[PDB]
């Protein structure tokens, strides 16, 4: 009769200012623990050096030996919520008297009941010890049907919080306002509804589906329908399901049992069901209970595949049988959360058991702004300077940043602020620094969204100023990318979506890929680059999985740009010479682009050297609408490229006007000018080892050495294709 | 801790009064008896099942001297969630006889002999104790087909002994056993071979009729008061969401009750819910928010579309409506008159002709249910996984009236290119041919397929049972293009701009709907960019967007389609 | 046995003498604790890792006041042999906190529940003592991607239990987890999350100055009298080593030591090996003898042909030399001028003239890793 873990339950009697700070313990446990009824006994939630220094003796056998009754007021300091495990430690140290203490009202009102005619008899006349901080309900103390709460914050003169012995004549009470308890010592705090933002439409449904089956089961069942028993939460990882479960566990007055971990299964054959039976029996026996099962996919794998052979299959069968066994008499709610909605066994997902399924999607601009504002409000006001406009601008910048990425961004911004203060103020105190917008931007640059972690793309940073080519292509790309995202209200009013289709066809090496690099560098949006034949795989159907995963990642990573470099590699399958893999890949690409499900926000950009080889299926409107000739650069573009390349060189010292040379290179291309500049620089390097300028002889030698690759036949074919397109 | 608190009753020391109705107080949490009236709609299947079960269960002396195989089963099966368990409970309760049976989660024993001795003892008791109905649920789970290697383990001897033992106590003697399973084709063919399962009564999901009747019956069962009782509202909610099974209807009722509770709490600050009443708004909200299991396992839904949103050649729409509505509405006319509908249409034409959009509109209008399947998607790395996946998506997810399967690109499956033998494409093509040549009418599957290159379709797939109906699906005419322009220009201010929307359509003679939509979108984008928001489109925007369109439908593919149609005949 | 023998102290018999030596005598071959000065060329990454481990571990009041949760796990990825394991060892030695050597797949056992019980025990032990560090090596194998068809069931279960332990109902308390692997892609995407693995450091291949710093640190770790060298000589050696990493540099130094020992043995018979010294030509011989790690997978050899072996036009030789050697021999001029190498040549002409012989001569006297690939191969 020596259980290892002790559970907790609230006192059956309502709070009345007496019998507080008392935890009834079974006499058998006290005898085994050689602890007398009157002493200081500490309980902790499996470690964390939890302290409660409260000891009391239970009455007869009505109080179960395994459970220990904890008062609501004393349970607030330990953050235990109706069932947290408790460990007994016989060692204790007598604390000294306290010469200073303060009281802080939880509500925004200050200076209430200054006379304390009856308040003193509550927290000062009690013989039991009082922690430096808890939450007091206080019942009713102010006229006007309103209840106030007092939370003592500061108290002075191994354990998590040193308990202080108080007395009426020991010292004076300095009543003030300090919101919750001070943070000079770590203390767990509850998570309220305001912590979660952007999920109001789902949080109200969760609140209803938690309160009704628990608080009023028979009142709801009076109509003639069984109350809902199972709630399923599914969505992208790091969206806020765990926080929602923690909040609904903390704010509810029902028992909670944590069985999320795979610890429920054991090496013994019978234990993996005996533990579940015992847990469900304990949940039903006490009556008001809530069950949380995270990662239900691992606990309950699908039976369709061969992975769920015997043991997990029998676990699912036992879970289903025990779920169907309970009736509508009790008040129990089962909560299941998983990253993969489709990995749950279809037997569990039934209207009779798991009808209430709530889907949590990627937060939009409004939800991101709400989350950022709530996080900043939770953060100390004096530690931040950003206003509402800056928060809104940052939220608008964040496209695929889910709440996890937002928290990481805030942490990185704090770290950047600390580093900047250390570097600039010569080792000043870190607490004095405050986060600014520059630190936020630096943290945004440093941190990549979690959806792009699986994609590794180390690319040089190139800006639109580097590309001195035609401005029409840049203008079209900007109007297609930034305009729909910047002002979507006008698009909604006009009822037109984004074309999201780019077909870059022209001479090789002129500007198609550079626009992809330039867009990736100076777009501020997630960029995905997919090569032509890089998706093909030896196995049959693996290319299908790869392209499906790529499209799913693009969809889940907010509106983005997909660059299909050399799309003509897998396009032409006019006959049986090409393998079926290419045709299947093309069909999958068409289905993912248009298919049956519409694509919103994502932009498809394709660059090709042989537009004719592309099948007419991809050439139809809705896939690659816009077509850009992107031919050889003009005289102004070539002059700009020459100026950009020669800017490092000393133009005035050499005397070149950068105009005769630009006129000479009329028939060249964008890359040929860069090659000529590189050759001239190399010749200048060889002529005198170290040099800071390039003369005309090196340019002439480079021009002689350059071989033209833009044959007139290719340009004629391209212009013929352009006139055919019209 | 009792089902009902006991008491003490006497004759003269207590008063006895009679009032109220048949139903007892719900505070006792006692269950209620289930009768045949408690179930509506399926009743047509029930009439056949009650007659077939009953002749054996009542006087079976007619086949005594015949000596033929005795009928001891019905073999009930159907789509999941169809409500077979409530029918089994009803037939057990109304029989007022022994219902000795056990289902179990494929119950077995570690001992080699006990796993069979348990069943032998159960059957011996059934022979001695003569239960009227014996229930065997989930036959596929406990006795699947022997074709699969892992499926024949353990259950082979069990099913063999069951088959060789159920052939006893002929002529006189009821010993009727009921076999209910979810998968019809997963049952062992040797088990279906004997004649006691010749009927093979299958119950379909409720549809069209009797849905309002069962909704009213369940509403009356749950509560005769504090609820709305309007025939028109019930008929409308039955017509809406044609794919909802009875279980989905019960889930809808529960969610409507939940919505009523939430609205009442939010309106009256946690008032007693006895006086609250159900309205149509909460029913509509529940219908929107339930997301039942009928559309589950897919996680994707087709976008909303209506007939007004699409304007095209009336002939194609009329032909499609004739193809879909005529067999879907009823089947007794087809069965009695012997009309054999093709149950398959091939949509071939130039790209961007809105054959996929036409299929989406067809699914939205009549089917009220879409099951999107992709050709290359069913392909799998494993050799045997592709066939299993295609068989599953063809059989398990298929619903009789609701579900229709649409192929985005059927031309990517039949051609194997340079494939000699032992190829995944060849295997899936053979499986599809085997699973498509054994169906003539079945349940009105009326499959629909779309393609862009018909020349690869004719590879061991084109058969006379599937080429009966051919749709040319031509480019839109001037009237259709004008309708598309008017629909896309509705958001614009035609009166303020003064454009007649006629010369633009006349100029775009070789264009289609996709090109018209693209040029309108380009004009709108240019108008937004040039002067922010203006809420109008000018002639210069259309002229600027005209050059954006890349030619159009070139005559070579049109001639190829025409000659292919002529060859097909 | 007993590692180093102990001794008994007396008041007047010790006769304490003071000596100028930081480290103990080497005759006991006792292990030497690692210091942050051992790792060179990674100053930014070392500083970032040190901050991201120390701040969550010590004085968490800064994060508690700001209301932001401290980072939980740090993932280190890069090519093998870069020095991630040595970084973990040195950060374990320097930090005075509890550690848990979860080396690899030793957690999983034949028992169904042991693979999770071991992880639960490890996490409970880490949570019991507030200052605790977890060092995970080869996390890809123990926790692979669940989406893969080869993931299985026990791997999915261990991934789920690791996710639950890292984040869930029971929040971790001032504990940092360090994970090192050579394939970050094989890591499950759920693990690579801002709530669990926000801090990711890509430890890339060291460049020229990092290699020079590593070589200088190694030579400083070595005794001054053992080898004689100059700073310019070390810089030249580092410049010669192109594809070398810290492991390659250590192997080069060890091979140089062995070559010095064998040269001393050859020159003088029965001579003391500890009296030898390492010279520049010995290091060059060791460098040309050993092979880079990246070139181990390449198996192709040809007879050595020199630049003087090619008989032909000198224009091609000059142009290819200015293309190849100039960017590496003198990169400051290219950086100042902002011009890169053309990076491309095509040799078209009558067969058998100079192409393959030029390729062989480059592979011999280029001083750079050479890769040969055929057309239909
Ligand atoms: N709505 C939100 N508002 C603020 N922060 C959020 C929100 N959602 C998530 N976060 C941040 O992301 C972290 C991870 O979220 P949470 O612990 O709730 O897990 P989860 O979304 O259920 O995901 P997982 O399945 O990976 O456990 C939170 O600790 C918090 O820092
Ligand atoms: N207009 C330009 N402005 C600046 N640099 C240019 C321009 N055109 C070409 N270049 C230079 O020439 C290089 C060759 O161009 P790039 O290979 O990016 O073109 P591409 O047509 O997209 O490529 P490919 O045809 O090989 O797929 C560029 O990387 C850049 O350095
Ligand atoms: N005639 C009917 N009238 C009203 N409700 C019905 C009727 N037939 C079936 N139902 C509904 O069907 C459900 C009965 O579910 P049941 O326990 O029989 O399992 P099931 O989902 O049909 O089983 P399975 O998939 O194994 O065939 C209930 O929601 C019930 O309201
Ligand atoms: N009559 C019409 N009314 C409205 N929109 C139309 C009409 N005809 C065509 N469209 C537009 O053109 C598109 C063409 O259809 P869709 O993009 O689904 O391709 P498809 O013709 O089925 O070709 P593919 O074989 O390439 O799939 C429609 O989605 C729609 O946007
Ligand atoms: N920066 C460095 N300075 C000095 N020596 C180094 C350095 N980096 C690596 N080395 C040497 O290379 C060896 C290999 O490095 P380490 O043991 O840390 O493995 P690792 O790079 O993490 O690779 P693996 O994937 O094999 O575990 C080190 O033991 C050390 O001798
Ligand atoms: N200039 C030269 N100096 C020395 N040896 C030469 C010279 N030209 C040719 N040879 C000899 O002739 C051989 C043929 O030259 P090499 O192997 O480089 O062929 P190649 O030009 O690549 O032609 P191919 O591959 O088309 O046969 C050389 O390997 C070498 O032995």
Author numbering:
A (entry chain B): 29 to 185, 209 to 777
B (entry chain A): 209 to 777
C (entry chain C): 209 to 585
Authors' own words:
The type II AAA + ATPase Drg1 is a ribosome assembly factor, functioning to release Rlp24 from the pre-60S particle just exported from nucleus, and its activity in can be inhibited by a drug molecule diazaborine. Here, we report Drg1 structures in different nucleotide-binding and benzo-diazaborine treated states. All structures display a typical three-layered architecture, similar to those of type II AAA + hexamers, such as p97/VCP and Cdc48, and the NTD, D1, and D2 rings show an apparent deviation from a perfect sixfold symmetry. Comparisons of these structures indicate that Drg1 hexamers transit between two extreme conformations, a planar and a helical state.
Next, we prepared a mutant form of Drg1 with two mutations (E346Q and E617Q) located in Walker B motif of the D1 and D2 domains, respectively. Mutant Drg1 hexamers were incubated with excessive ATP for stable hexamer formation before cryo-EM sample preparation. The cryo-EM structure of mutant Drg1 hexamers was determined at a much-improved resolution of 3.5 Å. Similar as in the structural study of Rix722, the introduction of the Walker B double mutation allowed the capture of an endogenous peptide within the central channel of Drg1 hexamer during purification. In the structure of the mutant Drg1 hexamer (Drg1E346Q/E617Q-ATP), a polypeptide was found in the central channel, which passes through the central pores of Drg1 hexamers formed by the PLs of the D1 and D2 rings. The density of the main chain of this peptide was well resolved such that we could build a poly-alanine model (23 residues) for it. The six protomers of Drg1 form a spiral staircase to accommodate the peptide. Thus, P6 of the mutant Drg1 hexamer should be the “seam” subunit reported in the structures of Cdc48/p97 and Rix7 in substrate-engaged states. Specifically, while the polypeptide is held by PL-Is from four protomers (P2–P5) at the D1 layer, it is clamped by PL-Is from five protomers (P1–P5) at the D2 layer. The D1 domains of all six protomers are in the ATP-bound state, which is similar to the substrate engaged structures of Cdc48 and Rix711,12,22.
